[PDB]
Amino acid sequence: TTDGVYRVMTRGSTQVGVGVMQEGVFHTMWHVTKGAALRSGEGRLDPYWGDVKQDLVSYCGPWKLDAAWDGLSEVQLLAVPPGERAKNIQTLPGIFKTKDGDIGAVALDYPAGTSGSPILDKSGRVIGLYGNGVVISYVSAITQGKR
Amino acid sequence: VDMYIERAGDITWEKDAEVTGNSPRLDVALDESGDFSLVE
Numbered sequence: 001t002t003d004g005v006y007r008v009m010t011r012g013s014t015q016v017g018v019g020v021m022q023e024g025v026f027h028t029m030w031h032v033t034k035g036a037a038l039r040s041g042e043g044r045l046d047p048y049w050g051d052v053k054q055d056l057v058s059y060c061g062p063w064k065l066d067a068a069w070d071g072l073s074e075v076q077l078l079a080v081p082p083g084e085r086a087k088n089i090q091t092l093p094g095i096f097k098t099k100d101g102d103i104g105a106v107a108l109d110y111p112a113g114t115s116g117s118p119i120l121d122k123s124g125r126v127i128g129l130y131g132n133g134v135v136i137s138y139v140s141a142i143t144q145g146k147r
Numbered sequence: 148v149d150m151y152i153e154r155a156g157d158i159t160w161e162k163d164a165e166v167t168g169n170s171p172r173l174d175v176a177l178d179e180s181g182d183f184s185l186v187e
Contacts, residue, residue, distance in 0.1 A: 002154060003157075003158070004154050004155070004156060004157055004158060005154075005155050005156050005157075005158055006152040006153060006154050006155055007152065007153045007155050008150060008151075008152055009150065009151050009152070009153060010148060010149075010150050010151075011148065011149060011151075016150070018155070019152065020158065021154075022158075026152065030181070031181075033150060036150050037150070038150050038151060038152055039149055039150065039151035039152070040151065040152050045152075052179075052180060052181050053177070053179060053180070053181045054181065055181040074166075076160055076161065076164055078156070078158060078159075080155045080156070085155075085156075086155045086156035087164075087165075088160070088161035088164035088165075089164060089165055089166075089167065089168075090164040090165065090166040090167075091166065091167060091168035091170075092168075092170045093170060094169065094170040094171040094172055094173065095170075095171075095172045095173070096173055096175045096183065097172065097173065097174050097175065098174075098175055098176065098177060099176070105171070105173070106168060107168045107169045107170065107171055108167070108168045118158060120158065120159075120160055121160075122160055123160075124158060124159055124160045126158060132181065132183065133183055134173065134175055134183040134184060134185060136171065136173065136185070139171060139173065141183065
């Protein structure tokens, strides 16, 4: 239940993704878990909110992350790759231009087990999650939910 | 099959992070299944 970034593992064992614990709620991408329940030691986390189109899911409570890229500043991907210590990768986002407005995007390509890793602003706030994007090389949207 | 979680770190900005990656501007569409595709 501690705040932080977490590996999402499956059973040998395999890392399928990453997520963010904040304010008692676990946040990850829908395609990582498909809404399955999660074990946390002896405890169980059940899905609470999910949306395939946003590709997000929250456990134990509603989506809590609400910070947004400012459109100008560099950000940091807090990547947690399989088999590797959590590490920060700083970048200037590009932009996904859509009929419903612009979304930040990071042109960084890490293993699929890294999906769900948080993208941070300089204040340390999570502005979205890494791992839903397009191929031009892979480019990931900065995917943020609604609080 | 059961999924489980393991803590991997604090959520913190790191002053000495590696810096890399370009900043492309792309027109895209997002469909009902959550898939982004390119648009022209």
